[PDB]
């Protein structure tokens, strides 16, 4: 955004009005989510200091390292990739009320490079990956779609929600996109039955 802004012609009659205010907004919204994440890193440290249990204290301390790195910088592993995702989807709720509550995309595709690398390097097991995804579901289950307008309430009665998680399908090159994570999502749904997430599978002729 800063580069696009430096590339405007701010001597001409129009860019300063037609384009610069948008790029300023983008610069600001990037600060917003980064500031928000950083305040979590500090909350984790303070919580760690106030926590006697040694194990949870280490957990909270690793959380603080994670929240210091993501989403400001590229995720370095599966756990940072998921917490990045978590910050974006939660800040999307702060941004606005997207219908059905914001959806989560092709989690088995964009998380797979991180998952395969950590598995292979021994920093992560499939049971730990499944636990982290299930942590997502139980906190998503605490965010309830609040409709004030009666029409919305009666068109989505019972706290109707569809925070879709997509698994399977095809790659951008049109081959099957099934991977180990695709199966992991389906296992977890069986093992940990619950109304979250809204697991949706793509089917094709192959």
């Amino acid at each position: 955004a800063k580069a696009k802004l430096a590339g405007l012609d701010l001597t001409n009659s129009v860019d300063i009005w037609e384009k610069k205010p948008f790029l300023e907004a983008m610069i600001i919204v990037c600060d917003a989510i980064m500031i928000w994440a950083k305040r979590h890193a500090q909350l984790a440290r303070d919580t760690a200091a106030a926590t006697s249990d040694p194990v949870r204290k280490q957990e909270l301390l690793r959380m603080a390292d994670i929240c210091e790195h993501v989403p400001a910088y590229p995720a370095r592993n599966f756990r940072e990739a998921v917490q990045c995702q978590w910050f974006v989807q939660m800040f999307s709720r702060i941004e606005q009320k997207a219908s059905a509550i914001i959806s989560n995309g092709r989690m088995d595709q964009y998380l797979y490079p991180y998952y395969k690398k950590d598995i292979e390097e021994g920093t992560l097991t499939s049971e730990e990956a499944k636990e982290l995804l299930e942590c997502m579901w139980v906190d998503m289950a605490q965010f309830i779609d609040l409709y004030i307008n009666p029409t919305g309430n009666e068109f989505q009665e019972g706290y109707a929600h569809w925070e879709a998680v997509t698994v399977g399908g095809q790659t951008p090159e049109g081959e099957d996109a099934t991977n180990e994570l695709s199966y992991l999502f389906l296992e977890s749904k069986r093992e940990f039955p619950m109304t979250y997430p809204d697991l949706a599978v793509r089917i094709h002729s192959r």
Binding site: L10, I16, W17, K20
Partner: protein, 186 residues
Amino acid sequence: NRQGRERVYKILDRIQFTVPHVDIERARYFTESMRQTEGELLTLRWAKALKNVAEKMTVYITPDQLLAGRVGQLGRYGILYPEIDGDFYIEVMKDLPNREKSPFQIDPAAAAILMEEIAPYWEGKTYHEHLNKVLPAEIRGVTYHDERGLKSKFVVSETSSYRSALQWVPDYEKAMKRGFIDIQNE
């Protein structure tokens, strides 16, 4: 040289040497309508407001005129357009009568309606407030001396916050040749 011009000189003699009054009726009835039509197409709001003015404002025949119609009270008068610069009213109205350049007088009743009913509606809504609000920081320096934009810098001066528009000439011929029943039927 007044031979044969008794009528126009009688009109002009009464008003020459007098301080103009502020008439508020156009602004009052304009504002009364506009505050009820927010969110509609602007020229539709505006036409409804002009109809409200046409129905409610005092209509006049200047004593001895052959022509019917004014847009304000007898004597020399001006009228108000708070849609432009209503944010200045609180600062300027008190000083109008003593203004070194172009003084105006305002009757106390008219001023009460102006400052208690009209001006409060237009807070946060005037063209001037909006322009001042959004002007890029790189442009402010040559435009306004102050943060409220009430004082020009007189370097690169904007001129849209003291008038609605450039000069204009409407098509009078079309009005007199067709009438507004036929224009309306179109």
